[PDB]
Amino acid sequence: QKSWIESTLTKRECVYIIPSSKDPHRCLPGCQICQQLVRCFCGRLVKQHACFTASLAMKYSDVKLGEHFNQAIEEWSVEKHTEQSPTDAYGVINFQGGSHSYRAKYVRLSYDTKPEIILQLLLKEWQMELPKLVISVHGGMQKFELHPRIKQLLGKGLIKAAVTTGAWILTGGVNTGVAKHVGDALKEHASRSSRKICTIGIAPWGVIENRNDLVGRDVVAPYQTLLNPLSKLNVLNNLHSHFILVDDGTVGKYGAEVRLRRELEKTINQQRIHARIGQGVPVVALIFEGGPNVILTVLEYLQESPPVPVVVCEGTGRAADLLAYIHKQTEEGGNLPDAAEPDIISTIKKTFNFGQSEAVHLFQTMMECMKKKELITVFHIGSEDHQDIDVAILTALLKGTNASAFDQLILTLAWDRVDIAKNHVFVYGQQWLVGSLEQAMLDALVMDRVSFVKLLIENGVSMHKFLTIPRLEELYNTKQGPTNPMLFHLIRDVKQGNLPPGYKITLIDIGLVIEYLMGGTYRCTYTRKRFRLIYNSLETKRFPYPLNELLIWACLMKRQVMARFLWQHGEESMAKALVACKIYRSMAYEAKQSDLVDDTSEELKQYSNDFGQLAVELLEQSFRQDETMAMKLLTYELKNWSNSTCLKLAVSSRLRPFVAHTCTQMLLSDMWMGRLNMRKNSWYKVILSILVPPAILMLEYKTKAEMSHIPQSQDAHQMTMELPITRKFYAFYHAPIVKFWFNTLAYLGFLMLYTFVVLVKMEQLPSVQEWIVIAYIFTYAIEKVREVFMSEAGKISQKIKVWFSDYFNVSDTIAIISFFVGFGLRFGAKWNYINAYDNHVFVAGRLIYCLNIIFWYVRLLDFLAVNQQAGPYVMMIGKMVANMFYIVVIMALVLLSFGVPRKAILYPHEEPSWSLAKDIVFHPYWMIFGEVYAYEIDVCANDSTLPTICGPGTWLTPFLQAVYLFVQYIIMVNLLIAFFNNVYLQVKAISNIVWKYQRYHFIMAYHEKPVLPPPLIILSHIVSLFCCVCKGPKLFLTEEDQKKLHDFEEQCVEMYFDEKDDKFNSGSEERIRVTFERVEQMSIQIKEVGDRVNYIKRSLQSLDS
Amino acid sequence: VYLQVKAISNIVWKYQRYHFIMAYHEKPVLPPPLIILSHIVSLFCCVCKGPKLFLTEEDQKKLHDFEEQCVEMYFDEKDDKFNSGSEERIRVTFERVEQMSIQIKEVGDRVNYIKRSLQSLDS
Amino acid sequence: LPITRKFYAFYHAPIVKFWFNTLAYLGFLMLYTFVVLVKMEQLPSVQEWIVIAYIFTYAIEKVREVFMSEAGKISQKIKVWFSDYFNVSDTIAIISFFVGFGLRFGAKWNYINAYDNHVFVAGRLIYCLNIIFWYVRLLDFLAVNQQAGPYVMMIGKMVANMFYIVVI
Lengths: 1105, 123, 168
Ligand SMILES: CCCCCCCC/C=C/CCCCCCCC(=O)O[C@@H](COC(=O)CCCCCCCCCCCCCCC)COP(=O)([O-])OCC[N+](C)(C)C
Ligand SMILES: CCCCCCCC/C=C/CCCCCCCC(=O)O[C@@H](COC(=O)CCCCCCCCCCCCCCC)COP(=O)([O-])OCC[N+](C)(C)C
Ligand SMILES: CCCCCCCC/C=C/CCCCCCCC(=O)O[C@@H](COC(=O)CCCCCCCCCCCCCCC)COP(=O)([O-])OCC[N+](C)(C)C
Ligand SMILES: CCCCCCCC/C=C/CCCCCCCC(=O)O[C@@H](COC(=O)CCCCCCCCCCCCCCC)COP(=O)([O-])OCC[N+](C)(C)C
Ligand SMILES: CCCCCCCC/C=C/CCCCCCCC(=O)O[C@@H](COC(=O)CCCCCCCCCCCCCCC)COP(=O)([O-])OCC[N+](C)(C)C
Ligand SMILES: CCCCCCCC/C=C\CCCCCCCC(=O)O[C@@H](COC(=O)CCCCCCCCCCCCCCC)COP(=O)([O-])OCC[N+](C)(C)C
Ligand SMILES: CCCCCCCC/C=C\CCCCCCCC(=O)O[C@@H](COC(=O)CCCCCCCCCCCCCCC)COP(=O)([O-])OCC[N+](C)(C)C
Ligand SMILES: CCCCCCCC/C=C\CCCCCCCC(=O)O[C@@H](COC(=O)CCCCCCCCCCCCCCC)COP(=O)([O-])OCC[N+](C)(C)C
Ligand SMILES: CCCCCCCC/C=C\CCCCCCCC(=O)O[C@@H](COC(=O)CCCCCCCCCCCCCCC)COP(=O)([O-])OCC[N+](C)(C)C
Ligand SMILES: CCCCCCCC/C=C\CCCCCCCC(=O)O[C@@H](COC(=O)CCCCCCCCCCCCCCC)COP(=O)([O-])OCC[N+](C)(C)C
Ligand SMILES: N#Cc1ccc(COC[C@H]2O[C@@H](n3c(NCc4ccc(Cl)c(Cl)c4)nc4c(N)ncnc43)[C@H](O)[C@@H]2O)cc1
Ligand SMILES: N#Cc1ccc(COC[C@H]2O[C@@H](n3c(NCc4ccc(Cl)c(Cl)c4)nc4c(N)ncnc43)[C@H](O)[C@@H]2O)cc1
Ligand SMILES: C[C@@H]1CC[C@@]2(OC1)O[C@H]1C[C@H]3[C@@H]4CC=C5C[C@@H](OCCC(CO)CO)CC[C@]5(C)[C@H]4CC[C@]3(C)[C@H]1[C@@H]2C
Fold this sequence. Notes:
Chain A: Residues 1073-1105 form a coiled coil. Chain A: It is found in: Cell membrane; Cytoplasmic vesicle membrane. The structure is cut from a larger assembly and holds three copies of chain A. In chain A, α14 packs parallel to α16 (436-446) and α25 (601-625) runs antiparallel to α26 (627-633). Chain A is elongated, with a radius of gyration of 45 Å. In chain A, the strands form two sheets. A ten-stranded mixed β-sheet of chain A has the order 6-1-2-7-5-4-3-10-11-12, with helices on both faces. In chain A, strands 8-9 form a two-stranded antiparallel sheet. Chain A has 47 helices and twelve strands. In chain A, β4, α7 (178-188) and β5 form a beta-alpha-beta unit. Chain A is mainly α. Chain A binds chain B through residues 100, 190, 192-194, 975, 978-979, 981-982, 1068-1069, 1072-1073, 1075-1076, 1079, 1082-1083, 1086-1087, 1089-1090, 1093, 1096-1097, 1100, 1103, and chain B through 2-3, 6, 72-73, 76, 84, 86, 89-90, 92-93, 96-97, 99-100, 103-104, 106-107, 110, 114, 117, 121. Bound molecules: the ligand CCCCCCCC/C=C/CCCCCCCC(=O)O[C@@H](COC(=O)CCCCCCCCCCCCCCC)COP(=O)([O-])OCC[N+](C)(C)C (10 copies), the ligand N#Cc1ccc(COC[C@H]2O[C@@H](n3c(NCc4ccc(Cl)c(Cl)c4)nc4c(N)ncnc43)[C@H](O)[C@@H]2O)cc1 (2 copies) and ligand DU0.
């Protein structure tokens, strides 16, 4: 059948017939009038059945021969005289009119359906999600009216209570009862609002208009709101999203809905509210009017097991006005005050007139309701009852139903409502147990509800006690919440490619992920001996810093709102923000590169850049407070983050705004000096003190106190304890500023020689000038092999892959290799002794030198770039060569568009020759640079320098060249002037940032360099290899300075969050709106007090007469 | 004039990129020395005997649902932006200080008619 | 995905048709540049026949583009095809080439010295100018890139706007 509905759900049709009561309507021909009018006691008359079996009985006179023994007339039994079949009416209502064409779903099932099959319909078949609340609205059965005051408020909270909790509203569906005003509340307060409420309406099929219109299989129904005055039935309301229409077999009568509805309430309250929680989906009953069937229903619920509470609304109709009335005059449980029988029966006799016996009967039904006063809520809309029915509907389930504070909290957790938990579960004087709070935390973390994690920490949860191994090991192994498919992939990589099927994640495996994601020499606390030991054992399992471990969890699970929350709790705030930037950045890179599912890398990089911006904004806060302590914050060993450093973590993530912040640049400037005080010295004296060593003793240095924020070597720090003479020489030659100039003077004296060598004749054997040059380039290359081995990271292929990621290290490799190719050819050649340059091998070697020299001038940009101003312009050149590339590809096309016709028109009689490759490209390029070749244009002219080139067609070339230069200069050169001038500012801004970033790697490279330059560096090597075989900088803090520094960081995260709010709360946009939202409330309170004075005037006339 | 010519020119390039790419679904496989094969094969298969987005029935359904949901979000977010702006909150603030100011002097007039009752019920 | 479906999937991709046409077009200009720079005897060299084959078969491709354009109204198929710069220049570049091949090929060769025939000269010089259309057409292929394309499109918009400074 290709439909679960057709196979399972069943209709009902009165196959048998039973005529109406007795009476022929009028009109003597008794036989005719019988078949014409007479209803079946089914509910439909004889000609509506059609009931093919009964049809061959319709002809006789009907089914069932005549008088039929009046016992057997009433023997109508829906179980006996009515038949099932694969249903006809299930599809989609397409409400025509209204607006937007609101679209609902329906079905025509039998009341013989089992209760579970309806839950199988809503969820599996109609594709609905199981809710966290059900609101069963009973009330008016006949169309009524509400004060537009009382209308809109119930439409504020019945919505808001159903949006947040993903609730189902079970109505009657028919547009005559509560469903009208429930349905209207959907209208005014934007039921869509990007979050539709799954409003269901259960009605019986026998009483609804347009039954035929809803017939068909998966058919879109042209159903309309045509309230014909001649109609007798009800119209399906528009704004209800779903409908269940019981097929009682009869037509016309009500009744065959109340079973299914109550059984659906059971069938939902017998479902787990959420896989993590062990309650059932609660149910609440809401009331807007009522007759006897309603207040009887109210009694049922209070009697039920489990008891379903009730919310009555004073000011809405017959019952609800009464149920608040009788309830207000009542006491603790079960009473009327001594003289109230006369008054209350009169209200019954007036409010719903049955009269003095059915009043007293239903009055006794009202007694047993008021007995269970504890479950019923009487939210009265008059002034301020139960704080805005939202609270009342939701808090009503948190009343005398014996549910302990745990069960009270966990339900507000599933709903994701803290305002309830704050104001109604953490009420003054609550009876909390030992593990209830901790257990609710484990549920909030896994379900990713930060606002309860906040609430529980505030209300007494210590995350040191709640962070054991199995818990935090469980937290990674959860599908009960927002999970990361990226994590299980990262685990497969570190595990050599294997993944056993069950595989509960462990913490030693998370450690291998973080070590992989942070890279280099990072070593997590999960892979150490202390942890691996106690791990196999499981006070001693409590993680002294848990919020360092849940910040990683939140980030490996891609739970940002949890991450930013768990970040601002604890200490080491910048460090946690800079690790987090590196985790996501690596996850983004792996997620991008790894081809597993849809990318998710745009999400992770933004998460990285969010934490990377926090760290910068903190560093600015620290820096504006105390510049000296802020520089210490950059360089202290962390001891919880693998003995790393906040700079080292920012550099690790290529986080340029932190490295280009004016604190790092202020520190890097102070490491550049060393012990020297270059505030009260000058570069004249540093250079002179290099060439005149004894002048090292007459320039000023820094004390141990100015050097307290500056990281140092072990030896450098020991020599601050003592300033003697031999300490002032160590302090000088080991400064990065001194190593620099001491290398520039050697490098400038290098080029002066190597320029001299290349311009002067070169005999068979190298001159003294040339041996000094080979010594430099040789010893300089040993220096570079030393740089690679002592780089940072023990993984060799990374030492190499990072060293060739630098322009001037790649060119040195080319410049050094090329030079010894040149020296080999120069030196190892059979000299001729008649004329050099009869040896093509000596030529090659010399010409390699004459080109190798170019690498060594361009390298002066590495030394010029140490300056503030020069450096950025150096860095621009690369960024600008990259961006002009395509204007220059067009300029090269225009070149060959011209050079090939020019050469072909002027030189026809050419054989194939490699000169053709030159001549199509040579002169047209030199035209770009001012050379017009004025006397080679018009080769047939008298002033021509190419009169032999005159021939047929050569008059075309001046036209071609006129076009050529127009295109080059007047378009393509000025487009390029236009390019640069309109891209200068942002390339100059990036280039200041990139220069300030490379200034880290530059300066920190010079702590590592030896003292002596690259002719004399070999001494420093031989001394180092002699002291390596026979036998970086840290910020040393004493114990009282690590103390005062952590106090400094905490104080600056306070000022940060404070000033961030004070800026926001003091802004224009935020004061306009709080002004706006109070003129809301006041304007209501003036008309309220404007209404009261109207009720003060009435008293004046009252007390007057 | 560089910036606005460069901005138009990104737009015009992105427009011509339609005609360019959609021209290549139509092109044969072989380039214009060997394209003649693809022609002879096409004239041989034309005498002897563009791209559509095929959706099944359940994807035309889920797609029309997607469009309707996005016109909702469009009109909603267009109003929420407007109703939440400064100019619109200043004026609804303005138009209520109109009404309240009238209702204070109104209630400021009533209390003048409450004082008269005090002297009245006094004597 | 079977084997013969992976070949269909490849050669019928627009990215593949492109590069498969650029390599043929780049190898076209390399020949047609060689033909124009080297002496041209009475009969075309192998390099030049391959060039005529391209420009011929390439023109049949363009007649196919016009007929299979979109809209059955013929004068619209034509009016829309000549609304494109590089289709107009191909019409000039293709027509000019066969004027040139006709004069080059159908001339009474002299056998004492070429260029005593003013008709052979004209045909050759048409090739030496027709070559310009076929370089500029590399901007139609360079313009496939993000960055290059817009700068290509600027040149026209900027030649139009500088017109009156250049009249002065
Ligand atoms: C961190 C990375 C960056 C640093 C990179 C460092 C590595 C740089 C790598 C450098 C090596 C590059 C190649 C060297 C030259 C060989 C090739 C050549 O042209 O040979 C010639 C010389 O043949 C000889 O026999 C004479 C060689 C003399 C020694 C000079 C090279 C050794 C120094 C290397 C010091 C390097 C180590 C530096 C310190 C580590 C052969 O030709 P010929 O015999 O002259 O003439 C033959 C024909 N004829 C006889 C007819 C005329
Ligand atoms: C017909 C002639 C045509 C061409 C002619 C010349 C032009 C040829 C130009 C070639 C450069 C190609 C590199 C492109 C730029 C890439 C980006 C970059 O910053 O690169 C590098 C810097 O930039 C340079 O290294 C630029 C070097 C050329 C600038 C001019 C040199 C002046 C000295 C010579 C004077 C000699 C004069 C006399 C000589 C005899 C470094 O960056 P990176 O580490 O690679 O990082 C990539 C950036 N990213 C991370 C943001 C992605
Ligand atoms: C769409 C945009 C429009 C463009 C604008 C219009 C384009 C300009 C149009 C210019 C008109 C053309 C001028 C040539 C006229 C014929 C020459 C001739 O018959 O004899 C000459 C041949 O000389 C040549 O054949 C050289 C051809 C002229 C080159 C002009 C280049 C453009 C430079 C300017 C471009 C900027 C223009 C500025 C505009 C104000 C010489 O005479 P002869 O008797 O053969 O020989 C005598 C012997 N003798 C040589 C030994 C002495
Ligand atoms: C979608 C739109 C874009 C595409 C457009 C496509 C259409 C392009 C249109 C192209 C046609 C252009 C004109 C062709 C040449 C004729 C003019 C000429 O110079 O004749 C000469 C050659 O006269 C001959 O008799 C030899 C001709 C040889 C055949 C070459 C042309 C035919 C190929 C065409 C293939 C085109 C079709 C391509 C495929 C469809 C006459 O001079 P001569 O005899 O050499 O010398 C006389 C004097 N003398 C003897 C004293 C020296
Ligand atoms: C003395 C010399 C004077 C002049 C000299 C040269 C300059 C002569 C320039 C003439 C161009 C005239 C066109 C004006 C622009 C119109 C707008 C436009 O976009 O047009 C077209 C693109 O743009 C082009 O086609 C521009 C072509 C010239 C640019 C340079 C060519 C470089 C290659 C040659 C190198 C060869 C070098 C060697 C050769 C031997 C296309 O647009 P459209 O489809 O028409 O749509 C109209 C736009 N609208 C819809 C917005 C209205
Ligand atoms: C690697 C780094 C080393 C460190 C650098 C310091 C140590 C290096 C210092 C010196 C080493 C050189 C020894 C000098 C030998 C004297 C003979 C001589 O050269 O006579 C020449 C005169 O010219 C000179 O005397 C000057 C030669 C050097 C010029 C460059 C020096 C500047 C750099 C250093 C100082 C400034 C430092 C600037 C920066 C602050 C005559 O020419 P010839 O070639 O002898 O004659 C044969 C000619 N023939 C071949 C054509 C037949
Ligand atoms: C990776 C580095 C290694 C590079 C490869 C190894 C390079 C070493 C290669 C060769 C070493 C052996 C040299 C002799 C070659 C045989 C020919 C011969 O002997 O004599 C001939 C030389 O003919 C030449 O071509 C000489 C120049 C060739 C050197 C090319 C170096 C470029 C390498 C790239 C640059 C490095 C850049 C590297 C940057 C990364 C003739 O000279 P003759 O003997 O005097 O006889 C006179 C002839 N006569 C009778 C006609 C008058
Ligand atoms: C269109 C704009 C207005 C112009 C309209 C008017 C012009 C119309 C167009 C072209 C005019 C062509 C004739 C002029 C030459 C006469 C003199 C002559 O003989 O010159 C030379 C030959 O010249 C030729 O043989 C010409 C080649 C054919 C023209 C090719 C198209 C060029 C223009 C592109 C197409 C046009 C569209 C371009 C769009 C801008 C000299 O050769 P010779 O005689 O052998 O000399 C003896 C040599 N000896 C002593 C060394 C042995
Ligand atoms: C239309 C598209 C086709 C597709 C392209 C591929 C197929 C086309 C491939 C080949 C077809 C050509 C056959 C070669 C014949 C050999 C003889 C020869 O030419 O000898 C010459 C040497 O020069 C050469 O051998 C090279 C000649 C071609 C240069 C351009 C090839 C690059 C393009 C294609 C390849 C790279 C592709 C790049 C793109 C990725 C000697 O000169 P000559 O003229 O023989 O001697 C007479 C001289 N005379 C007249 C002065 C008296
Ligand atoms: C739409 C396309 C069709 C174009 C029109 C049809 C073109 C075909 C036209 C003509 C075909 C017939 C050629 C012969 C002409 C008569 C003269 C003659 O025979 O000999 C003379 C040639 O004199 C010349 O002028 C030769 C060059 C003319 C060709 C012009 C082509 C430009 C067309 C525009 C370019 C196309 C651009 C199209 C782009 C849209 C002399 O040469 P000879 O015979 O060797 O005698 C030696 C003389 N002597 C004794 C002095 C030494
Ligand atoms: N204090 C200080 C200080 C001293 C020197 C420097 C120079 O920095 C050198 C490094 O600067 C790097 N670099 C450079 N180098 C600039 C440059 C290098 C070579 C040449 Cl020929 C030129 Cl025309 C310009 N440009 C970069 C870029 N656009 N993006 C990222 N990195 C770039 C490059 O790896 C090179 O090794 C920077 C700061
Ligand atoms: N992917 C991709 C892609 C590939 C190629 C292209 C190139 O587009 C070609 C078309 O671009 C058209 N075109 C162009 N072409 C640019 C151009 C054409 C020729 C030359 Cl010589 C130059 Cl100096 C520049 N400019 C236009 C403009 N200013 N306004 C409207 N249309 C313009 C023109 O009709 C031409 O046919 C565009 C996108
Ligand atoms: C898309 C672009 C179009 C333009 C262009 O790039 C690509 O197309 C390329 C094709 C090249 C030619 C191919 C083959 C040869 C043969 C050789 O024959 C040696 C003979 C003898 C020496 O005497 C041996 O001993 C001489 C050189 C020549 C003609 C090339 C010249 C440059 C050309 C024209 C290039 C040009 C820059």
